[PDB]
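re: that complex we talked abt at group meeting.

here r the seqs, copy pasted straight from the sheet so there may be weird spacing, ignore it
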Amino acid sequence: ESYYSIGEVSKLANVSIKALRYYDKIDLFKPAYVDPDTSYRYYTDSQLIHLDLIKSLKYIGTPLEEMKKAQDLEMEELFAFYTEQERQIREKLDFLSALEQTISLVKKRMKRQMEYPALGEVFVLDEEEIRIIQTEAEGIGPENVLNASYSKLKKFIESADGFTNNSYGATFSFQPYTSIDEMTYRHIFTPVLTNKQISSITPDMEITTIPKGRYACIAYNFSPEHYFLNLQKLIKYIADRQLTVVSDVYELIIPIHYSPKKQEEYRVEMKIRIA
Amino acid sequence: ESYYSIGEVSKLANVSIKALRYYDKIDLFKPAYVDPDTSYRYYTDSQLIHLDLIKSLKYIGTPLEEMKKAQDLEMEELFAFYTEQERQIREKLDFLSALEQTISLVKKRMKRQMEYPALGEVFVLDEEEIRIIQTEAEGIGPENVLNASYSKLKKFIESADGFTNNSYGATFSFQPYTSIDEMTYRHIFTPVLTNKQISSITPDMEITTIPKGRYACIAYNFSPEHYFLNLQKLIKYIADRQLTVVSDVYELIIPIHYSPKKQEEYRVEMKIRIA
DNA sequence: ACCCTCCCCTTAGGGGAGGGT
DNA sequence: ACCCTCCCCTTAGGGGAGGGT
Ligand code: 118
Ligand code: 118
Ligand code: 118
Ligand code: 118
Ligand SMILES: [Zn+2]
Ligand SMILES: [Zn+2]
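got the structure back, here u go
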């Protein structure tokens, strides 16, 4: 006849008093006997074995609440249980692994923004392909455009990436605009990350890309009086070197800070493909 | 000038009112203006952009609490952040993957208990190798043995597997015992699962195995009056067919139910290797 | 129809006091 | 020394009422 003080138990089955104390109250693991005089908790050498399954269970991560009926069942039962437990583990797994990738996609995209060497002048390079989706921007000028203008397409991205548009886009025609009001938005995208089956795409959105062609682009930080010049100087550029234009302009925007705390600024990126 | 009702916001950035309502209270995302007459919440088309990072952040799984200083930083900052976030994801990952395996080890071991075809008689087969650890059972007889007798070795297993001893063992000498008191425990193990570096092993425990040799074993459900016969009949067996003994007996125990609710019973497994 | 608030639920405990063996 | 209790903390909200536009 071996009987134990709660201490002993907690020392024996590495456990916190408060833990077991509340396991008693959880009714999962009550002591073999409470001294109705001193409210003290005493357990029997028997009991301990019960502590295994819970340790286990809690290890895996199953609410004590479930651990409740968890005990009751016998082997062929618990076995299936334990497997159900694996379909679970085996689930969250590949879920996150995704993110893992997902981010590693984002990051790269991020760094490639900082890696811009010429802030303010034309950059001309070899770019990669852009899985993106847009709608046709019915009327909206760079002066019109909002965010509420994004809803749908947004609702969509997150619905197939979990991750929202960090990047914001719209395309527009290539012309020697006199003014800003001289240009009105064509299509307005969002960059897609996942290569998963984007389905349920309501036909109002098209699903395509920015090819892996040549680009003559330039970046900066938006400023009204700014934006324009930069576009101007873009125009000049091609017009000068005379290169052959092959798409529209991809002025794409991304914020630099996300702080409510202050004045929102962001980096801009008008780019044009050419051959 | 576009201004929105909380509804709109919740409809626009797929979000729950209560969510944002509490984001305001969290002070993360407060409205652009609260009607000091009607306490109504109004946001600006500006704001929304702020909602991205949080959606994102909450997506990844970062307490809003952290999301707090999360915003404030600028790119080269947030970028590193986002990576720290990946060391995290990239962490929990391989952690669980482990379990995944760990269990798939257990399960198999489990099923191999149900797959016992002859409950009550001798089974003779080709077995696999057993990474296990034990101590030398100083005196303890099958009559002595407890659980408190396990502590250490137990403390250890969980400390290197997360998972506790589902299986319980002890070895003992091979002899034609007259009685139960005629046998006293030699070594008393616990089966090790992980193939990881079990270190800090205080020299009081040895780390070895049950080989992949031949076994003449039998199982059942313990019962005092029982246990004995079964051992007896084991003895008989070898003595009869005359096979050559090569180790000690591995009577190993495992419970069948873990329910506090009732009378604890368990399946037993005296096994002997022979050539 | 929308919004706003106040309230009371939802895990698994942990720290810390406050008195008693 | 140990135990026991009572209490008040710890996320991210969600349902539901209760009255007001
Ligand atoms: C000899 C053996 C056990 C008890 Sb106890 C007990 C009493 C006071 C303080 C600690 C332990 C006991 C149990 C029920 C009724 C009266 C006394 C006792 C026995 C087994 C398990 C736990 C406690 C007393 C004498
Ligand atoms: C009218 C319409 C949109 C913008 Sb703006 C903007 C707003 C604040 C600070 C900086 C820029 C904008 C317009 C053209 C090109 C780049 C930015 C704007 C951007 C995203 C979402 C909503 C408005 C500006 C005036
Ligand atoms: C024209 C444009 C805006 C407001 Sb309003 C407002 C008032 C009552 C109910 C809903 C909106 C406003 C704001 C501050 C002080 C007085 C009136 C308002 C404007 C921009 C953003 C949010 C609300 C009023 C008239
Ligand atoms: C004295 C010492 C240990 C056991 Sb038992 C045991 C206890 C209750 C119900 C069934 C068995 C036991 C002894 C020899 C072989 C198999 C089981 C026993 C088992 C594990 C831990 C503590 C005691 C029995 C009497
Ligand atoms: Zn078009
Ligand atoms: Zn020895």
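couple things i noticed - Residues 1-73 of chain B form a domain with the Multidrug-efflux Transporter Regulator; Chain: A; Domain 2 fold (CATH 1.10.1660.10). The helical segments of chain B are 6-12, 17-25, 48-60, 64-72, 76-114, 151-161, 224-241.
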